[PDB]
Design a binder for this molecule. Structure first.
Ligand code: NI
Length: 146
């Protein structure tokens, strides 16, 4: 897997740079994320937690390596409802959170290859991403905790 960092860190709370086009190098990171994100204990990982300043995040909200999601430049479009999750991410320490996040969201991303999709999520996948995005821009979810 990858070299993920814990909090507080620099990458984790630093900002990333959005990209316009993708390739089979992002696919490459993305996988490295599944590989890791899985290995540890998260549903969704951002690529600001290994050590990168790009926008790549993955999701795994199913049970058996079934729903393996990817998001490269997922700008946010819609966000309906306001829910939280009684869960922890990765970087994160001993405590877990019930962070006030959004409930449902519709985004527009690029994928592993650089295929653009407008994806909508609900309740928790919705969270998975929301969360990872706070990371991509510099906040760990330790704002709504501390
Ligand atoms: Ni997190």
């Amino acid at each position: 897997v990858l070299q993920v960092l814990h909090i507080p860190d620099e990458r984790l709370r630093k900002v990333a740079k959005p990209v316009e086009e993708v390739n089979a190098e992002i696919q490459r990171i993305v996988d490295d994320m599944f590989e890791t994100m899985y290995a540890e204990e998260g549903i969704g990982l951002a690529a600001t937690q290994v050590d990168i300043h790009q926008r790549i995040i993955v999701i795994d909200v199913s049970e058996n390596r079934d729903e393996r999601l990817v998001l490269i430049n997922p700008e946010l479009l819609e966000k309906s409802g306001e829910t939280g999750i009684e869960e922890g991410c990765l970087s994160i320490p001993e405590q877990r959170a019930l962070v006030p996040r959004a409930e449902k969201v519709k985004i527009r991303a690029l994928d592993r290859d650089g295929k653009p999709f407008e994806l909508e999520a609900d309740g928790l996948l919705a969270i998975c991403i929301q969360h990872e995005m706070d990371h991509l821009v510099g906040k760990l979810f330790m704002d709504y905790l501390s």
